[PDB]
Structure 1
Amino acid sequence: AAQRYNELSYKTIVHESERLEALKHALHCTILASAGQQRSRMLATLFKDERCQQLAAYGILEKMYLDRIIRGNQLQEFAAMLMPHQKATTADGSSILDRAVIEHNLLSASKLYNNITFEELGALLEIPAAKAEKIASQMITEGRMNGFIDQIDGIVHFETREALPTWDKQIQSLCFQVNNLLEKISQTAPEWTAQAMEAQMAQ
């Protein structure tokens, strides 16, 4: 439905109100589910629209774009922006919107970790630790969470992906951070800009 509504909003044969109607339903399809990968590509494509900046929930798409864990405030903001059939809590606990918000919150906690306990992820997202393990394993079942679960030690590790050849990639990144040191030379303070562009580069 997101690709449906979005690429109907990009076509130009339709009436303009109907373009932005398809666009706002693409924003509904942005916020109501959590991001799948091509889904998130279409959401960032929506983020490049000034007409989406004309929409009411561009701050919600902004926090989707900045990989932000959604707090209750902007939650209730776009909850004021829903249609009541889209407000369906059909015996799933919290709503499809809200369960997918918890999905996106766990998703943002995934994108930023490398390990977190069931307890620290539970109190991180205001959920029980056993429920943190449960829904975290259900998202690894959904695959959009990835890592490895130690139930006994109580930690959903992410795939930590950090070692010494990764640190050798960080040595090439240390060449590019000597370049970023040149950026700090030209950047951080203007007296430091003049005097460091003198001293570290010309001397």
Structure 2
Amino acid sequence: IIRGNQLQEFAAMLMPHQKATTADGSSILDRAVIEHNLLSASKLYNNITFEELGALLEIPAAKAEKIASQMITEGRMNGFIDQIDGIVHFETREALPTWDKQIQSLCFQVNNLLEKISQTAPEWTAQAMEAQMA
């Protein structure tokens, strides 16, 4: 997530035609970074309210919703908006598929740990495998 304080050194090197305001008080630079921030924020959240969404993107409550609905309907992000309670649901996992994913990760950690065991002390690993019969 790119905050608005690390882009001051970037807007100075932009070409003069790229710094054109769109008649709403916001330049071109702080519109693409807003959409990028919103798309990146959907990878860290399962759902977020409008007030909190408008706390890390500025644009408090009325423009964050408009931009969020604008990114959707164009195949740019996955989600849906519940305007009654003011919350945006991005991606919900279905429990059982998550269980199999975590099982795969658990087995991956088992294999990786044994790989380091056989890589650090190969002489001990061979003795342990033979002793596994007894």
Q: TM-score range by the shorter chain?
A: 0.7 to 0.9
Structure 2 Cα separation of the partners of residues 151 and 138 of structure 1: 14
Q: Which has the higher helix share?
A: 1
Bigger Rg, which one: 2
Contact 1:70 1:105 in 2 (8 A): yes
Segment drifting more, 114-123 vs 126-135: 126-135
Query: What is the CA distance between 1:90 and its match in structure 2?
Result: 2.7
Tell me the matched-pair count.
134
Superposition deviation, residue 71 in structure 1: 1.4
Deviations 1:6-39 (A, max 9, x none): xxxxxxxxxxxxxxxxxxxxxxxxxxxxxxxxxx
Determine which structure has greater relative contact order: mean sequence separation of CA pairs < 8 Å that are 6+ residues apart, divided by chain length: 2
Alpha-carbon offset, residue 143 of structure 1: 2.9
Q: Aligned-pair RMSD on alpha carbons?
A: 4.4
- Rounded to whole Å, the distance in 2 between the matches of 1:150 and 1:173 is 33
Instruction: Return the TM-score normalized by structure 2.
Output: 0.76
CA displacement 1:53-96 (0-9 Å, x = unmatched)? xxxxxxxxxxxxxxxx1112221111011011111113143122
Sequence identity (%): 100
Question: CA 1:126/1:94 → structure 2, altered by over 3 Å: closer, same or farther?
Answer: same
Deviation at 1:185? 7.3
Structure 2: any 5+ residue segments left out of the alignment?
none
TM-score (norm 1): 0.52
Structure-2 separation of matches of 1:171 and 1:152: 37
| Unpaired runs of at least 5, structure 1 | 1-68
Q: Relative to 1, partners in 2 of residues 1:181 and 1:87: Cα closer, same or farther, differing over 3 Å?
A: same
